[model samples]
Target: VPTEQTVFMYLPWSDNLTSNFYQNISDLESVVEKNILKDERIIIFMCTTATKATLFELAYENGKSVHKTLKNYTDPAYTTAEGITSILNDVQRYSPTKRYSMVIGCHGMGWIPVSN
Candidate 1:
């Protein structure tokens, strides 16, 4: 019963950035706990490691913050364009809403090429 939905994508490719991502998630949970409405939904897609990603729904239910894991991606595909589209498709399939938005958190890599 969501009127609007927002997806937060966190891609901390570096081990050092993982901790900051966790902190951001924690802060986001607190925000949801304080202001989330019944018709508004918040979803998170986080890369837990170089080859692992997890998607979940964050909700404030019964006066508590709760998250339900929707999917776990254990391949490198989560970093590709096709993979990202697939993930968004899955999100839509599972949590359809009238309006959807996305927020991405990652190291700013402007025009620099990524090295393996």
Candidate 2:
């Protein structure tokens, strides 16, 4: 946990985050501030390598973290539609809220193909 928090989350491999080894600790101090809220300050990111891309998003508050939120996914999983819907279904456990937002990051490919 050196702080340079750039997570290279490749998934289904169980704890692949170990080698992901963070990016810039000093930078995290400020970036982490802009996003997290007082109650929902602790944001956790998870992923898999063998799989394409999947994100689980949520906002917790008042000791009861599971609330109104959603998980959004867009990939060429062949089962992309199913995958997207499934992620949304799973994230629904968070219960969701009036206004929701997601923050996903990585190799920086927006509207780009997973294939390099």
lDDT of 1 by residue, 1-116 (tens): 76675555546356568888889889889887885657877888887888788889888888888988998887747657888788888778778888787877876778776774
Please, what are the lDDT tens digits per residue for candidate 2 over residues 9-115?
22222333424423322234345445454433222233434344344323333543332223433442522677545554454334333333344433444777767
Tell me how many residue pairs clash in candidate 1: 0
Assess candidate 1 and give its TM-score to the true structure. Answer: 0.85
Query: TM-score of predicted model 2?
Result: 0.37
Candidate 2 stretches with Cα past 4 Å from truth are 1-45, 48-79, 114-116
Tell me, by TM-score, which candidate is best.
Answer: 1
